[PDB]
Symmetry: D2
Amino acid sequence: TKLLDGKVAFITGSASGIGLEIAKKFAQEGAKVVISDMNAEKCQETANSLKEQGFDALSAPCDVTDEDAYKQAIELTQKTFGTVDILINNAGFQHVAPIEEFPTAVFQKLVQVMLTGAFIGIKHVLPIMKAQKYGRIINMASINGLIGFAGKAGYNSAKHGVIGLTKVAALECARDGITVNALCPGYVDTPLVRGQIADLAKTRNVSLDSALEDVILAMVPQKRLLSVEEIADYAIFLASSKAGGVTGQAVVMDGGYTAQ
Amino acid sequence: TKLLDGKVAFITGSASGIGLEIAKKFAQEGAKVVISDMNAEKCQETANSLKEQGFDALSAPCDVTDEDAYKQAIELTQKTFGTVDILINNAGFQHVAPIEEFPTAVFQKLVQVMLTGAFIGIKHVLPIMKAQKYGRIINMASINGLIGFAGKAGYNSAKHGVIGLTKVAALECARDGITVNALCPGYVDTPLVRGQIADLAKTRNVSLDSALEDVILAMVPQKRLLSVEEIADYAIFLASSKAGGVTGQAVVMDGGYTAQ
Amino acid sequence: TKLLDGKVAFITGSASGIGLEIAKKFAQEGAKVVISDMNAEKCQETANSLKEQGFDALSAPCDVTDEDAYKQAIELTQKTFGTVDILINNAGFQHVAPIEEFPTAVFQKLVQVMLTGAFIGIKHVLPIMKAQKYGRIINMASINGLIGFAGKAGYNSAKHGVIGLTKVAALECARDGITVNALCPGYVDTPLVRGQIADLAKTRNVSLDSALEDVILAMVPQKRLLSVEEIADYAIFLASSKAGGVTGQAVVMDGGYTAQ
Amino acid sequence: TKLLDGKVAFITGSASGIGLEIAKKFAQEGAKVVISDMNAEKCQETANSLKEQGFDALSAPCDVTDEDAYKQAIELTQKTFGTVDILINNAGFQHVAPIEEFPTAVFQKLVQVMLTGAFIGIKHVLPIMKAQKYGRIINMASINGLIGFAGKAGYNSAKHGVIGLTKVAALECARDGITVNALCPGYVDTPLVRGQIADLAKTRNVSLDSALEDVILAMVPQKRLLSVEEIADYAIFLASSKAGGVTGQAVVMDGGYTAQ
Ligand SMILES: NC(=O)c1ccc[n+]([C@@H]2O[C@H](COP(=O)([O-])OP(=O)(O)OC[C@H]3O[C@@H](n4cnc5c(N)ncnc54)[C@H](O)[C@@H]3O)[C@@H](O)[C@H]2O)c1
Ligand SMILES: NC(=O)c1ccc[n+]([C@@H]2O[C@H](COP(=O)([O-])OP(=O)(O)OC[C@H]3O[C@@H](n4cnc5c(N)ncnc54)[C@H](O)[C@@H]3O)[C@@H](O)[C@H]2O)c1
Ligand SMILES: NC(=O)c1ccc[n+]([C@@H]2O[C@H](COP(=O)([O-])OP(=O)(O)OC[C@H]3O[C@@H](n4cnc5c(N)ncnc54)[C@H](O)[C@@H]3O)[C@@H](O)[C@H]2O)c1
Ligand SMILES: NC(=O)c1ccc[n+]([C@@H]2O[C@H](COP(=O)([O-])OP(=O)(O)OC[C@H]3O[C@@H](n4cnc5c(N)ncnc54)[C@H](O)[C@@H]3O)[C@@H](O)[C@H]2O)c1
């Protein structure tokens, strides 16, 4: 069966990692998918490969902090596919430092990409969704939106913020056939994380295996990275017509991290 | 596709309402389902109808407060189907009173059915699941496990308690291929609730429609009862092989109740 | 100054540990204190020493699971001091086991002492407090009321439950000048805990110091036991006329345990 | 007794409302208080009146979004009083609009004042506090940091964010004698709120009394505004040497709003 059959899905940061898998898996479920990221070359390359596999894919690159460019990617989507049924605000990045050595500019940029970016997306899709009395907004948050972690002042601040935006947005459209949720993964096996494992391995003079098993997974009860496939599967449920009563939630898939 | 293909699902309180729909929908997803409740007559009638529709159904009635009878229903399941892959602790009931007029016996019985009952189920399935390094335990909790509501001393106490049991159980089996989650519905269109709408309509001398729209749905942003179909659909996801990284969570489907 | 000047404080489990310090410190703040516990000999000894220090102390021993004896301790308080302004539900105990080896009787008893006990206390003081349009109820919960911990099925279930009872009770008396809060300590330097340090030291063949510093404080950011003095100081604030707008809260003092 | 005796308290937004009361009440508890706000004239006027009442008060005006001016107010404090023991990040404002009509600039400014402002304060006091192995940081958040409210996209996003910053900061200094908490008031009787009552009274053609009792207090179980005195009293406890084991918490004083 095709759980997202001829729905139109716009996914920010979809040229790598969780967003790329979400785009791929949404297409397999019958979605028309919009590949959007900074790297406009990976975006065409991505959408072009999905088209060769017989999928409906549009390249609509944009910096989510650039409201003019984000608004025009949304208009190109409307022009191309007729609507936006599903928005995934996934674009993000990381900077780990103690607060004293945390550049204020970088704090502000993490917040601008991962909070203000989601707010821009939502502001511009809410009209399209309210008109059709249907939609699904998923803000890719993190357990770091629900707990503290030393060195992640900007990230945890931005992810905490996007859960607040999620609840406010959910209340504003609860009557309009529209859900607004924050999907909160724990550690996922992504380019992002294998880099951070490499990072920790160099600096602590340990093997990639120890770096992963003794540091990163130290506080994960299941002692494993989640697969992008697992995040994508939860995204499909939340993005589907079957999840219309789920709204204003921080939805957690963290191998038990936050249960302790 | 059949998301629960030849999994064995044991569901407490499955002769009516959410448990009956879960049993029906789990069967459509290829589960072998065990109908278990107080009313042993409805249990045979239920399982007999599922068998006539070409489903694999066992009647294993028991009072979940009766640990001998619960343990024997689990053994009859093992004998019949070879294992238990999925436990749904769904059995429950309600008594609304101000604390001063809340009989202590009734407080204790709500807790015994809806907390101690879940603990008995889990204690007896954990061996079977740990041996096979696979399982799914879903404790049917409520938003009343996450918030207060005047008049529900025993219910809210028991539902809060089963979320605590959920987290403890999740941590004890996180390495064993086993997930333990609490599904937290808001108001569902059930025999239970249509009765409580009738109740409120008599006592306040209003129509069933006002009783529903002005009292019960007063604090539901979506202003609607959830369908048993919606709870069942979330239960299928959480009970499926696709949700192996979801554990120790209060998973909320409440039309936005708890977002405000 | 005397923050509890001629208030009447009834404290369950007040013959040792946190309850004994609360009784002592409440007396220093001008409270009339009721010492209540299982050990009726320690209760007279306690109250007799407070009297010799020029304090107003009553011995009213009772098992909090014995509703007849709890109701009569409350009546003896009314007879002796004229009212109950402050109830501290502190009585408790611990049994750590994996769920499979967790006797159901012991699960039920942890819940009966630490949930049903608090409900009995509240049921019997709510009339006295509602009549006078004043009161303070503090349920001694734990971080284990807010998170999971492996081996604590009964404890975490009971503490989770008493936070639910707290919210329900708070909503029932929010107009009556009455607050209902759950004080949630982390690890406190108590007879209870020094025993559990001794326990862990024997079984793991390590020093008391390693047992404390490497096991118990492993997940405490501040890397220290809290003093009974610290819990008592928060109890005084919450029990004082200054905290009338604090109600229905899990109030956490855990050296940062739950922030991660 | 003087609970803050010769502690040095720097309070942002302290020329009106909660910050002004905190400054006044901290002075009565023996603090040396720094009055800091946009209005540099109210700041001198404030500090000058505290000096005439025999208090230790410094006027150090600054825009908390201006990191150069905030850093220099902190240096003037060090020069004047020798240290900073207590930081209250209180500066804030409100803009209520549906997301579609919510100017992105205004979203960004609410976040810059109430999140980035707190991060600037913390970055610059953490060195002073870590050197002396003592401090207290209180971020004035709101229940709107813990729940959703329609029309408050920027506010709820910023307040949610500052709770995240609170937990991260708490973990970074848990060993250094420093606590970081977010005080979360409900509706307080402030210039801010009496304005919003006037606002609602005009627009809905109702009396100030109905506007307050039927709209604002609709979801407050205690059906009353909190006094600035009540927030100040909790701030004193959290800012005192008695609260050293409280850290990384959203500390709620909301007349029961969030318990339902
Ligand atoms: N990987 C994990 O373990 C993990 C855990 C929790 C949550 N998350 C969150 O999930 C999301 C996906 O992360 P990921 O691990 O797939 O990797 P990633 O962050 O490398 O991928 C995100 C994509 O966002 C793009 N991007 C960055 N800034 C952008 C901007 N301003 N505008 C447009 N695109 C921009 C990047 O180019 C990248 O391709 C992020 O929001 C992340 O914070 C990740
Ligand atoms: N209906 C709602 O709106 C709602 C909302 C939140 C959560 N819930 C929870 O979901 C579950 C299902 O409730 P429901 O609305 O389908 O109706 P229900 O409570 O009428 O059905 C539950 C079943 O449990 C059975 N049962 C009761 N005590 C039992 C015992 N000791 N042993 C065995 N079986 C027993 C009953 O006979 C009944 O058939 C309950 O746990 C309820 O608390 C319901
Ligand atoms: N010590 C800690 O680190 C810690 C941490 C979190 C919360 N708590 C909670 O704080 C409370 C105080 O614990 P504590 O460490 O002071 O020690 P404790 O549990 O040894 O003291 C509690 C007292 O309760 C009494 N008691 C037990 N069962 C009773 C019953 N049925 N009726 C009456 N009295 C009974 C005991 O005799 C004892 O004197 C408990 O509720 C505990 O669960 C303790
Ligand atoms: N009043 C309530 O009911 C309530 C409820 C929850 C939380 N809060 C929070 O408590 C705090 C105090 O609010 P309040 O009601 O006393 O009123 P307020 O917001 O009017 O007072 C805050 C002060 O901050 C100052 N300020 C604003 N922007 C500034 C900037 N960039 N730099 C420096 N100073 C600046 C203002 O001039 C003002 O004097 C705020 O953070 C508010 O969000 C208030």
